[PDB]
């Protein structure tokens, strides 16, 4: 994974891309990993999920002006269409994704 490979993923995806910008020692971020993994399965045919370690790829975090962690950005056609910070439940997460889609 790299700044360029991530950008190319966004430009080529045939589905909306949900990106989780995370850090290892962030408690809310770690809390969201299993929840996001459950949601990724529930929404397997609607979205692609990508996780970006902001401490290992700060160039990507800087491009998106990431502040609080975790940050989630939902992209459509290579373009951010929604963004939120912090922990949320699986139900909230599915509802937010489905919202921004319609």
């Amino acid at each position: 994974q790299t700044f360029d490979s991530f950008e190319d993923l966004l430009v080529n995806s045939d589905k909306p891309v949900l990106v989780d910008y995370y850090a290892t020692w962030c408690g809310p971020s770690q809390f969201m990993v299993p929840i996001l993994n459950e949601v990724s399965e529930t929404l397997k045919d609607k979205i692609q999920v990508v996780k970006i370690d902001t401490e290992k790829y700060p160039s990507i975090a800087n491009k998106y002006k990431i502040e609080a962690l975790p940050t989630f950005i939902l992209f459509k056609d290579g373009e951010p269409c929604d963004r939120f910070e912090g922990a949320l439940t699986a139900k909230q997460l599915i509802q937010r994704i489905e919202d921004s889609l319609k």
């Binding site: 910008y21 020692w25 408690g27 770690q30 809390f31 902001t54 910070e85 922990a87």
Partner: protein, 112 residues
Amino acid sequence: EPSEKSVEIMRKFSEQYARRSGTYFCVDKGVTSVVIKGLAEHKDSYGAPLCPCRHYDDKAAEVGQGFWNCPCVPMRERKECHCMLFLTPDNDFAGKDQTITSDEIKETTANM
């Protein structure tokens, strides 16, 4: 890994600050524990417990500025804690504990 001495310092700090601010730990004490270890890791790396739930352009510089050294300015100003370390009692994720034991931290961060 953060040193045990730093973790214990940050654990006791968190209990004291929760009591002094009227805030409560998360119902999932694995969130509490990871944050305390992240605070301890930053204290070991940079010399102050820079907030671990944030992206920085330059962590060392930000430690020098001070805004995000725990307890950060938003927590001191309005009890806003993005780390979910200190929760107000009306928060959906708040429990009623202002105690986090060493065993809770060890059990929830063992794989880290």
